[PDB]
């Protein structure tokens, strides 16, 4: 649980006229690195990163049966095109399809949702809002360092849900894989309360180690959204974690 | 019809100066495609493609605890540099580490191995030869279309082992992923009995379909190994399956 601040990464942000935080955790060595200890420990709305615990709970309670169950589009056209189609758990996570996840949350219900999040130690002690809204409207907050602590539990199958639920969600988090590395992760974009931010949280699997990461950054327009991944990958490259 | 022959792809073999087959299977439409209906049905030694059933059997019997268990290098240098290190199930499949897998076969034993392959309906189901080498220089043979038949059952969690064993092995088969597709697959190089061949078998996961593949090509020399993937992706691209 030992930490180093590297202000030198601030350059990856200033390059884009942005502000933000990257937090890395070396699993083998049990050491953390961040450009900004303060912001690393500040709590923000999780927006679509909340689909990770939402997925786990829906699977564990059998709200969702498996990763192939189809959730049919409701016929209402929303302004994100990829939402306007049938989804399973994999594609719902891939395209961050809020309406699907909102239906999951309703079936979970407020009482089980609250208890499972307490079991996960996820988020602030007193959450609030409606069950299908709280994770959007500002009823729950989490810091990049707290995202890492949660992801390390999931990695290790240590959360208070079945092993099966955790394996399925880790499959759903798969984002990139090559001969050098696998990334399992989830993006977020929080717009409903200031400051508007983007998220990318997850890990990098190597042959010999795993690097957990969580980043957030100011995101006043959707124009910068690609920086969530690019800035994280710049830091991974600089740190020789990926080529 | 159910099966369609597309000699068009033969051009990918000769443009890279070799010979072989590709079999594709459309899961949604239950349709098959190959450039050589004949060689598609021809049985060869599975070589390291046998790591898929071997892994499944090892996990299900508890010979292997999970994907993190470490198999320590014995300190003897072998031909392939990447073998000369510690491995877990994920790295052992990535690097095709025969020594690890032989140790599995010995602990499984001839009687359980034979029974399991009967229940998998795997190729000629014949394990005459060394229990720790039959897939390499022994009596077992399998066709590309029998590979696909087996791989379909694995995809659907319908092999006679636990769901957990199947999900772990499908994780271990992860070869490539991006915003376009996921490939789960395993390579094979058979050199001890003629004709020498290369395999690549697995599947391509898309948003709303899965394309199983099984391919084998002549490999008189280890210089063509790279072609196993290259010819398959050439075919995949031509069929508009991957960009
Ligand atoms: Cl996976």
Curated annotation (Swiss-Prot), chains A, B:
Entry's induction text = Expressed from an upstream promoter, P(out), in an insertion sequence IS1999.
Outcome recorded upon mutating residue 184 to A = No significant effect on catalytic efficiency with respect to ampicillin, nitrocefin or imipenem. Very little reduction in dimerization at neutral pH. Predominantly monomer at neutral pH. Slightly decreases thermal stability
Summarize what activates or inhibits it.
Inhibited by avibactam, related diazabicyclooctane (DBO) derivatives and by bicyclic boronic acids, via a covalent binding to Ser-48. Inhibited by chloride, bromide and iodide ions. Not inhibited by the beta-lactamase-blocking agents, clavulanic acid or tazobactam.
**Gene3D superfamilies on file:** DD-peptidase/beta-lactamase superfamily
Provide the record's note on post-translational modification: Carboxylated on the epsilon-amino group of a lysine, with the resulting carbamate functional group serving as a general base. Probably N-carboxylated at Lys-51 at neutral pH in vivo and undergoes complete N-decarboxylation, at pH 4.1, in vitro.
Q: Name one GO molecular function term.
A: penicillin binding
Q: Binding residues for a beta-lactam, per the UniProt record?
A: 48, 51, 96, 228
Keyword vocabulary terms for this entry = Antibiotic resistance, Hydrolase, Plasmid, Signal
N6-carboxylysine: modified positions: 51
Catalyses: a beta-lactam + H2O = a substituted beta-amino acid
Q: Which domain of life is it from?
A: Bacteria
Active-site annotation: 48
Which EC number(s) does the record attach to this protein?
3.5.2.6
Q: Name one GO cellular component term.
A: plasma membrane
- BP term (GO), one: response to antibiotic
Question: Quaternary arrangement and interactors, per the entry?
Answer: Monomer. Dimer.
Protein's job: Class D beta-lactamase which confers resistance to the beta-lactam antibiotics, including amoxicillin, and moderate resistance to cephalosporins and carbapenems such as cephalothin and imipenem; in the DH10B strain of E.coli. Acts via hydrolysis of the beta-lactam ring. Has oxacillin-, cephalothin- and imipenem-hydrolyzing activities.
Family designation: Belongs to the class-D beta-lactamase family.
Q: What else is known?
A: When OXA-48 is present in clinical isolates of K.pneumoniae, increasing chloride concentration during antibiotic treatment reduces bacterial growth.
Name of the protein described by the UniProt record: Beta-lactamase OXA-48
């Amino acid at each position: 649980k030992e930490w180093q601040e590297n202000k030198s990464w601030n350059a990856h942000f200033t390059e884009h006229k942005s502000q933000g935080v990257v937090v890395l955790w070396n699993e083998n060595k049990q050491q953390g690195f961040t450009n900004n200890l303060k912001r690393a420990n500040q709590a923000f709305l999780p927006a679509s990163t909340f689909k990770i615990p939402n997925s786990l709970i829906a699977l564990d309670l059998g709200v969702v049966k498996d990763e192939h169950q189809v959730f049919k589009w409701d016929g209402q056209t929303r302004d994100i095109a990829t939402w306007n189609r049938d989804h399973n758990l994999i594609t719902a996570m891939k395209y961050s399809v809020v309406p699907v996840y909102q239906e999951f949350a309703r079936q979970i219900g407020e009482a089980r949702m609250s208890k499972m999040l307490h079991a996960f130690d996820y988020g602030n002690e007193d959450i609030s809002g409606n069950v299908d809204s709280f994770w959007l409207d500002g009823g729950i907050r989490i810091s990049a360092t707290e995202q890492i602590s949660f992801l390390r539990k999931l990695y290790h199958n240590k959360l208070h849900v079945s092993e099966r639920s955790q394996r399925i969600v880790k499959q759903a988090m798969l984002t990139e894989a090559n001969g050098d590395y696998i990334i399992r992760a989830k993006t977020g974009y929080s717009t409903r309360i200031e400051p508007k931010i983007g998220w990318w949280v997850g890990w990098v699997e190597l042959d010999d180690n795993v690097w957990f990461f969580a980043m957030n950054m100011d995101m006043p327009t959707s124009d910068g959204l690609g920086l969530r991944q690019a800035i994280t990958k710049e830091v991974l490259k600089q740190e020789k974690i990926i080529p």
